[PDB]
Amino acid sequence: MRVVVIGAGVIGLSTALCIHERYHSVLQPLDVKVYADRFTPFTTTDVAAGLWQPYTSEPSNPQEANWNQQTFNYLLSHIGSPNAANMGLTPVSGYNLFREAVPDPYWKDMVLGFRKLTPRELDMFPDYRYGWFNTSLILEGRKYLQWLTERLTERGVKFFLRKVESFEEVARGGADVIINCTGVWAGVLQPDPLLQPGRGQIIKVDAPWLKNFIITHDLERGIYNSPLIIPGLQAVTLGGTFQVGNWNEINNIQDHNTIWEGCCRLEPTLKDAKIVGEYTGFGPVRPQVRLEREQLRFGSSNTEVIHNYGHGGYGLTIHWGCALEVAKLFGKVLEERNL
């Protein structure tokens, strides 16, 4: 059984590990390989702000809420581990800030200690009038990918830096099963008109005094088009743009200004923060995650493709639930093949 995972961001690597950890002991032979044309530090995953938090509105698929919860439970369960920080993980507490009252989010009980903010709390943030406080987890994309690749490599999973031109070519080269974890670029391999780039630009800063996340929301402008500040393990991420349908991979000047001015207003101690980097990435925006089996029919038998893409601005937040479900679907494939 030859499995080729296409993609080496959070989705592909986590899925590869989940599959290997699940079946390595019971299925012989099992060959899992990862193909991708970008590894860390060059994926979208690497640019992510690094916070566990789903969107503020519930998902269309109720499956997705459970996948987020399963991911939170997975990550939280590492917290007393000696390797938590080496995985990119640490607990962080923080603020979600609004101009008016809004309903509690669906994930209020998944996180730790959720509550509304008190009036004394809000005076820290004069431009806002209502909010939440909770504890969540930082999962730093870059570190987590480094961790996942060490885990995979240790287990004998081989990596190939390879641009895939078609599923057909990978099937013809010997894959029995393909896991399609190509993120925003999935449409190249099979058109998908629901998949769009969520263009996000960030400024990375050394401001190690900042210990709490602070996410503001502008109801008139859509999620993450409002100042956000997320402390990472070694730097702070400043954000505030998330524009659907913009394919420009170059940083631009108005977005730099939106982020810097917005964030320096939220947190004016940033006047002394040294700029580390400025970066643009494309979230794989889609009305819902595509996670499903498809049969392909080239040559002299079928190759199964299992899609796992379209996680938008919440790929780190949802990844593990998605990985588990793919491994389950892969199990259904093995059963259909009398393995």
Q: Does 49 bind ligand QSC (CB under 6 A)?
A: yes
Contact range with a second copy by CB under 8 A, out of 3-11, 30-38, 169-177, 263-271: 263-271
Alpha-carbon distance of 17 to 9, in angstroms, equals 12
Q: H/E element holding 34?
A: strand 31-36
Can you tell me which of 197, 239, 262, 284 binds ligand QSC, judged by CB under 6 A?
239
Smallest separation, CB 116 to ligand QSC (Å) = 21
Q: Closest approach of Cβ 39 to ligand FAD, in Å?
A: 6
Nearer to ligand QSC, 7 or 94 (CB): 94
Chosen from ligand QSC, ligand FAD, a second copy, none, partner binding at 163 (C-beta under 5 to 8 Å by type):
ligand FAD
Question: Is residue 80 within the footprint of a second copy (CB under 8 A)?
Answer: yes
Residues 65 and 74: their CA atoms lie apart, in Å, by 14
Angle ∠(159,12,289) on CA atoms, nearest 5 = 160
Q: Which residues of 72-82 are buried (b: 16+ CB within 10 A; e: fewer)?
A: beebbebeeee
Does 231 bind ligand QSC (CB under 6 A)? Our answer is no
Q: Which of residues 190-229 bind ligand QSC (CB under 6 A)?
A: 200, 224, 228
Q: Binding of a second copy at residue 84 (CB under 8 A)?
A: yes
Handedness of CA 134, 139, 140, 141 (dihedral sign): negative
What residues from 185 to 214 belong to the interface with a second copy (CB under 8 A)?
207-212
Calpha distance 260→256 (Å, rounded): 6
List 105, 197, 262, 283, residue binding ligand QSC (CB under 6 A): 283
| Backbone phi and psi for residue 78, each to the nearest 5 degrees, phi listed first | -80, -10
For ligand QSC, the closer of residues 3 and 76 by Cβ is 76
Main-chain dihedrals φ then ψ at residue 30, nearest 5 degrees:
-140, 125
Which of 322, 4, 31, 13 lies closest to 149, judged by CA? 13
**Nearest distance from residue 47's CB to ligand FAD, in Å?**
5
Which ranges of the chain does DSSP label H, i.e. alpha helix?
10-23, 62-76, 119-122, 141-154, 167-172, 253-266, 315-336
Q: Which of 50, 12, 15, 5 is nearest to 281 (CA)?
A: 50
For residue 90, the minimal CB distance to ligand FAD (Å) is 14
Residue nearest to ligand QSC (CB): 313
Is 230 within 8 Å of 319 (Cβ atoms)?
no
Contacts with ligand FAD, residue ranges (CB under 6 A): 6-12, 35-38, 43-45, 47-51, 162-164, 181-183, 185, 188-189, 200, 202, 239, 281, 283-284, 309, 311-317
Nearer to ligand FAD, 53 or 117 (CB): 53
The nearest distance, CB 270 to a second copy, in angstroms, is 9
CB 216 within 8 A of CB 226: yes
Query: Which residue number, 176 or 267, has a Cβ lying nearer to a second copy?
Result: 267
How many CA atoms within 13 Å lie on the side-chain side of 105? Answer: 23
- Residue 9 sits in the site that holds ligand QSC (CB under 6 A): no
Residues that bind a second copy (CB under 8 A): 76, 79-86, 90-93, 112-113, 115, 118, 120-121, 123-126, 133, 135, 138, 207-212, 231, 233-234, 268-269, 271-272
